[PDB]
Symmetry: C3
Subunit: 289 residues, 3 copies
């Protein structure tokens, strides 16, 4: 038609021909256990629904044409047990990374990020950086970033907790991260600096081979109500878009996941924001040398 969108970029005959490979992980586990709502397992389907519909490939506002990129949907990870599921997810993400392609994983709960981080650690031995964009720390004794901070080959100096909220983070949890030389960038600090500026600082710390992990409950619930654990304050939709674009254009960002989208909580506005976030990553990615 006269307005080609993301759907039009799925021109890859086979997965191997794609720049960016989408992988779904339809499992609840994550913030639901921290008082949250069940339903994140429906995130990949809701994301797909709007993936079919949104995102002008040539954006004349940002002046970026993403026409040359090829996307591929590898479908959902399927398994009879959550443990097998985690294993299959890790293995899949690794194979995509190993051939130099970019895996984007749509969840599903936070727990997906542990297998995703492990694929990273395997693919770039001893040279991974990780940012967790999250209103929560996700480090309770398990939580995905405690699992990764406990990895021998991962340097905590290259771990950033981004847009975390003091009202939602235990002293013991902050202490654990900092004792591992990790960095806390509180919401107030991100707001003060500007979200993109602060994320630039974050990527400076994470360095090469960065896992950009985006828990969407880091967004204020006024923009992003449909998450397992809705935030009273947090990132705006525009800040999220702007951050996603930066991550897209930053050559050191080697994979992304997106956790906690929960259509049982809210099913129309929130999945659209999620797709628009991915869309901005795709535009940024289009500008990579």
């Amino acid at each position: 038609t006269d307005d080609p969108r993301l759907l039009s970029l799925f021109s890859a005959q086979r997965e191997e021909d794609a720049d960016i490979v989408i992988i779904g992980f339809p499992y609840d586990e994550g913030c639901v256990r921290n008082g949250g709502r069940a339903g994140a397992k429906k995130g990949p389907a809701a994301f797909r629904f709007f993936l079919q519909r949104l995102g002008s490939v040539n954006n004349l506002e940002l002046n970026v044409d993403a026409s040359h990129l090829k996307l591929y949907d590898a479908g959902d990870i399927t398994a009879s047990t959550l443990e097998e599921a985690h294993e299959k997810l890790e293995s899949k993400v690794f194979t995509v990374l190993a051939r130099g392609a970019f895996p984007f994983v749509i969840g599903g709960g936070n727990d997906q990020s542990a297998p995703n981080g492990r694929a990273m650690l395997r693919a770039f031995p001893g040279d991974v950086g990780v940012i967790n964009v999250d209103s929560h720390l996700d480090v309770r004794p398990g939580t995905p970033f405690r699992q990764l901070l406990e990895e021998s080959s991962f340097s905590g100096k290259r771990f950033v907790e981004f847009a975390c909220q003091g009202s939602q983070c235990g002293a013991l949890h902050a202490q654990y991260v900092r004792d591992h030389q990790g960095h806390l960038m509180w919401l107030s600090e991100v707001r003060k600096k500007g979200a993109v500026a602060a994320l630039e600082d974050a990527f400076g710390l994470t360095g090469k081979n960065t896992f950009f992990s985006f828990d969407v409950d880091s967004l204020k619930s006024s923009d992003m109500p449909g998450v397992s654990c809705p935030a009273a304050v947090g990132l705006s939709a525009q800040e999220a878009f702007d951050m996603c674009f930066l991550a897209g254009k930053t050559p050191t960002v080697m994979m992304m996941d997106m956790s906690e989208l929960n259509p049982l909580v809210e099913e129309y506005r929130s999945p659209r924001v999620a797709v628009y976030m991915f869309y901005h990553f795709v535009l940024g990615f289009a500008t990579r040398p």
Copy 2:
């Protein structure tokens, strides 16, 4: 009582005695066809409900007393066919314009703006300007602003697309407008300048006899969820109010319409925002020499 509101301004015996005449257009057609939801036809009723209830006529915050203005509700345009409806709407708006009064048209979908623009072109031959405040371009091969850009007597140099969004606008659509010498003012640009400042610039371009056309899906859905095509990002409610006040006080603005209000999507918060927008236009209008 001790707090006179908009309702109190409906003191006109007959329509001819009114400064501002309200006309309803209860038809869905507009963004519903671009993936949107049916229900905009219920906008005029929902608008009326809160019209009866809101808006202090003497506003001590802005220090504007709208007591001297007379409003009149001419009711809804009724017809057995959408085509006849468009014809009747155009004819009605024209008669209001022709006697020097101000028509405000509450929709209803975007399609209303084509008949509204035509009434303008008839009333001010070869000397009309038009601004479309819209997250979308509304120019697909039909869409109301393609119809008006195809009018012989309309100069595209005096057409502004205001607060449009790059994620939602085809390259072919931008190209069409610009090839007609029309102007795109992207949301990011409006945000950067300030909404009122940018609208001042817009009115500078539209010039005399300006049609101020406000598609409310230009507002972020956090403030304005009840529209056929809810926006993830967009104008805030305050920006919309501030813009409406400016339009009210700008003597070159000769009519206004308001499209896409959809109470089937959300029925309480959004119609209130719509009435408050009209209310701010009325305060601004009160200050016209």
Copy 3:
């Protein structure tokens, strides 16, 4: 556990051992009569639900540890008539004030603030200040702040209407307050100065023995939908949190109430904001000398 929250502060054996005493007032009366929705009577229960769940006692973002404070829930005021209820509320708040402890009253509608103000006037004869944080004036011929402005011992020079909205305030109502030497700080003015800066100015006017009265319909409905009279524009959640923290740390603030929380309108996001507001007051209070 590894993340102690507000619940952990309820260590007071008996009420007398508490720094802050929570009192519930489960009655609708307030903005419901100004076109609002019934249901504020459910506010205290909804507030309690999230009180059990939220708020890190040691906040590493703000670097305030509220561990030393003792909270106590005195339950709800119960009575066979609204009039008796008002009497019991006043009496209870007074006894808490009289022994130097801090009463926090969760409503329930605006009408609670009249008995609350009276307890203040009794406890600090002729030396009370009052701020009403409210999108509305609450002064109609009755409304709680007309009742207090009519008190012989109360100086209107020490009454501030904060974040009021011109679109929602009659000229006669503004006139009444100003004729009593009261001060109007319009939303636009609060926004221009910064919310905390403006509240500092307000506390400068209210002076000693200030009643901090927070009608949550002063918050924009994008953040705070669950109120009897939802606001199109207003304070953000962050502004409210920031204001509550300031009030907590300001030694002249001797009690607080919180009115208009309405879970019938919206039951999850809004009570969380209410608890987070109280939470910020508690952190601020923790820093009092």
